[PDB]
Each structure stands twice: as structure tokens, then as C-alpha cells.
Amino acid sequence: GPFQGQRQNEFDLMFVKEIFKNHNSNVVLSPFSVKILLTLIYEASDTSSNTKRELSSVIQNDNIDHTRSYYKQLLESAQQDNKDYDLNIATNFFVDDFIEVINKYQQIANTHYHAMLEKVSYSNPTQTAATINNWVSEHTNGRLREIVTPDSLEGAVITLVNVIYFCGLWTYPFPEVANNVKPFYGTRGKPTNAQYMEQNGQFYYDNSADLGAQILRLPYRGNKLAMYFILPNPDNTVNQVLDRINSASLHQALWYMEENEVNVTLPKFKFDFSEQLNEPLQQVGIREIFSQNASLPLLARGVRVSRIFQKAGITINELGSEAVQIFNANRPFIFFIEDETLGTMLFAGKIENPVF
Numbered sequence: 001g002p003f004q005g006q007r008q009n010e011f012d013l014m015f016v017k018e019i020f021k022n023h024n025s026n027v028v029l030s031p032f033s034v035k036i037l038l039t040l041i042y043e044a045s046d047t048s049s050n051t052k053r054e055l056s057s058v059i060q061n062d063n064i065d066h067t068r069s070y071y072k073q074l075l076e077s078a079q080q081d082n083k084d085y086d087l088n089i090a091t092n093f094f095v096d097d098f099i100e101v102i103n104k105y106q107q108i109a110n111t112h113y114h115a116m117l118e119k120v121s122y123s124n125p126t127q128t129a130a131t132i133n134n135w136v137s138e139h140t141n142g143r144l145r146e147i148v149t150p151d152s153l154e155g156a157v158i159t160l161v162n163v164i165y166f167c168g169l170w171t172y173p174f175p176e177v178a179n180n181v182k183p184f185y186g187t188r189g190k191p192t193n194a195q196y197m198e199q200n201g202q203f204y205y206d207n208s209a210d211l212g213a214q215i216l217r218l219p220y221r222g223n224k225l226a227m228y229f230i231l232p233n234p235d236n237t238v239n240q241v242l243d244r245i246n247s248a249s250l251h252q253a254l255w256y257m258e259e260n261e262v263n264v265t266l267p268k269f270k271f272d273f274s275e276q277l278n279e280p281l282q283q284v285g286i287r288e289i290f291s292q293n294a295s296l297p298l299l300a301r302g303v304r305v306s307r308i309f310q311k312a313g314i315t316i317n318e319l320g321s322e323a324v325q326i327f328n329a330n331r332p333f334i335f336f337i338e339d340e341t342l343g344t345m346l347f348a349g350k351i352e353n354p355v356f
Contacts, residue, residue: 002204002217002226002257007343010247011035011057011284016348017242018280020334024188028273028314028349030164032078033089036071036113037162037277037308040091041289043108044299050288068112074344075114077224084222085168087346090139091115093299094132094159096122100301117299122157125150132161136311140165143322147274147311156306158296164312166337166347167322168220174199174266174318184267185331186353187237194267194354196330197318203264205325206257211244212236215257216264216327219340220320226340227316228254229266231333238332238350265328267354272313281308314349317356 012031020027038058045051048064060066078087091113095101101117109115118135120128133146143165153159174197184194204217212233219226232241282290294304315321321337329351337347 001340002254003338003340003343005343006251007247007345009250009343009345012345012348013245013247013250014057014284015280017245018283019275020242020350021239022280023273023275024352026269026271026273026350026352026354028271028312028347029275029310030089030162030312031345031348032074033091033162033164033310034277034281036075036089036091036115037160037310038281038286038289039067039071040093040109040113040115040160041296041305042067043113044105044296045289046295046297048298054286054288068108072112074339074342077341078339078344078346079114080224082222082224085166085220085225087168087225088139088165089114089162089346090135090164091160091162092132092135093117094120094128094156094161095300096120096157099157099303102299102301105299122153125153128153132159136161136163139163140313141167143313144272144311147309152276152307152309157303158305160305160308162308162310164346166314167320168222168225169320169323171219171221172199172201172203173320176318182265182330184354187332188352192353194330195356196265196267198263198265200261200263200324202259203262203327204257205260205262205327206253207233208253208256210249211241211253213241214327215253216262217257218264224339224341225337227321227335227337229327229329229333229335231327231329231331234331238334238352241334260325262325262327265326265330266316267329267351268317268356269351269354270315270317270356272311273349274309274311277308277310312347314347 183191
């Protein structure tokens with residue numbers, strides 16, 4: 001069942017806010033993985049000053065040994081090998097040839113953050129882009145195929161790349177209704193038509209006057225993973241609910257959710273999203289690790305990260321992902337997937353127009 005603790009998402013939601021307010025399309029990312037990226041970058045700096053201050057909300061109590069077992073544990077729970085779903089989170093440093101990579105940092109990277117470093121030649125932008133993009137395919141089973149093009153590597157010394165993959169089954173699937181199309185009344189444009197799936201059942205639900213939105217919980221098998229949909233109220237937009245969501249406003253709204261009989265109508269969707277995270281990371285104040293006086297002494301022998309790339313994909317259908325109260329998601333709505341044993345925000349996204 002649902003998570004009864006307190007989530008460490010003060011930063012995760014700050015970051016979601018920034019992305020969502022810069023994209024009038026569908027979005028999907030992994031806030032937990034962005035935190036892994038920022039901590040791999042902390043491990044590599046000599047501060048392991050301002051960098052210390054800016055990463056306050058990502059590092060556990062200025063004690064590296066806790067940072068590592070913390071992020072190591074959340075990772076192991078999410079990706080725990082079970083017979084009901086498969087979730088994989090993968091990070092890799094693509095390092096230019098003239099950079100001497102320290103083995104112990106590779107050792108840290110593999111052990112505590114499920115990460116790697118790999119040597120490439122940016123002198124052959126095509127062979128390198130090929131190597132990255134085939135790795136992206138190797139560790140997402142083909143769900144994702146490409147994240148960089150040779151043009152996006154210009155000036156690249158180090159390119160930090162993170163993706164995430166998910167395949168799971170609903171505890172309670174929907175009936176197949178071949179011909180179940182209805183309107184979707186999004187913000188931009190005239191309405192559109194989208195494929196829906198319907199069922200009635202017992203699900204955690206609540207209507208939050210605080211955030212002015214409804215909340216639904218759809219669980220996956222494996223006794224670990226559940227998907228939350230947050231659908232604003234008819235008189236309210238997505239950006240309006242966001243401006244109200246913080247760590248405590250969101251904690252209370254999910255606590256109020258107990259099972260009720262729900263009529264659930266949800267638009268099927270299938271898509272993927274990518275952004276280069278340097279520019280939004282500086283908007284939320286993480287700027288020091290991007291200055292010209294920025295170093296990586298514990299990664300390379302005495303340079304910074306050139307570009308940070310992340311990409312995820314998400315699907316929901318009648319059987320899952322990659323497979324009386326009314327919750328009728330026929331307008332824009334937010335979603336996220338969470339490790340319900342610990343509250344890790346593995347996925348987070350939004351539907352501005354659901355296509356499949």
C-alpha cells in the first residue's frame with residue numbers, strides 16, 4: 001500500500017516545476033536520477049564552498065558515507081530483480097581521450113550510484129554519437145534509441161548521460177474497448193480525440209481543496225510500484241496546481257487519500273522526452289558546478305562536465321506500462337511513479353495532449 005513516511009523531494013519538485021514551466025508538450029523525466037547526477041558531480045569536486053551550499057538538498061548531511069548508502073539503497077529497491085516488473089536506471093560519463101579517469105572514482109561510481117565512465121574520441125563525432133546512442137538502446141531494451149546527435153557534442157569534453165526504463169503490470173487492468181475514443185480538451189488548440197480505457201474499482205483517491213485537484217493511485221504488481229495521477233479541478237490549470245505544490249502541501253494531500261470506489265477514465269499514451277539539464281539546473285540555483293572556475297579533481301587527473309543529457313519514456317495501456325466518484329482524465333494532468341516502500345520519485349511527467 002501507500003507510503004507513510006516523509007519524502008525527500010524538496011528539490012525534486014523544485015526541479016519538476018522548472019521543466020514543466022518551459023514545455024507546452026508532454027513531459028517525462030526522472031527527478032531521482034537528476035539527483036544521482038548531481039551527486040556524481042559532487043563526488044568529483046574538491047568540495048567532497050558554494051557548490052556545497054547549492055547541493056544542500058541532494059547531499060545527506062555533509063557526510064559522504066551517508067550520501068552513498070542512501071542513494072545506493074533507493075537504487076537497489078527500485079531496480080530490485082523481481083518477476084513482476086523491470087525498472088532500470090543507467091548513468092554513464094562519455095569522456096574524451098585526453099582525460100585520465102581515476103579508477104577509484106569508477107569504483108565509487110559503479111558501486112554506489114550504478115554509474116560508469118567510458119572513453120571516447122570526440123574527434124569522430126559520428127562514431128561517438130553512435131556509441132552513446134547504442135548504449136542508450138542497450139540499457140533500455142530498445143525503448144529508447146538516441147539522445148545525442150554529433151552536432152550536440154560540439155565543444156564536448158565530458159558528456160554525462162542518464163536514461164531510465166520501466167516495464168510493469170497493473171494490479172487491476174482495464175477491459176479492452178476497441179472503439180473507446182472521446183474528446184480531450186487541452187489548453188492549446190481546439191479539442192482532440194484520444195483513446196480511453198475504463199474501469200470501476202477500489203483505488204486510493206481524494207479531492208484536494210488545497211491543491212485544487214484530484215488524485216488517483218494505480219498500483220503495479222511487485223508490492224513496490226504505484227502510479228499517481230494528479231488532475232486539476234475543472235476551473236484550474238496544470239501550472240496553477242504546480243505553483244501550489246511543495247514538499248509539505250504535497251505530503252498532506254496524499255495522506256488524505258484512502259480507498260474509495262472510483263469510476264476511472266484515462267487516456268492511453270505513449271511517448272518520450274529529453275532535455276539538456278545544464279540550463280534548468282542553473283535556474284534552480286545549481287550554477288557553481290557550471291562556472292569557469294569549476295573542476296573535477298577526483299574524476300580526472302590534474303575540466304568540467306560539458307553537457308548533461310537525460311531522456312525517459314513512458315507508456316500506459318490497459319495492462320500497464322510497456323505491457324461513486326468519477327476520475328475522468330479528459331483534460332491536462334500531472335503524473336508520477338514512486339517507489340512506495342521509500343517514496344522515491346522515479347518518474348514525473350505531464351500530459352498536454354495524450355497520443356499513443
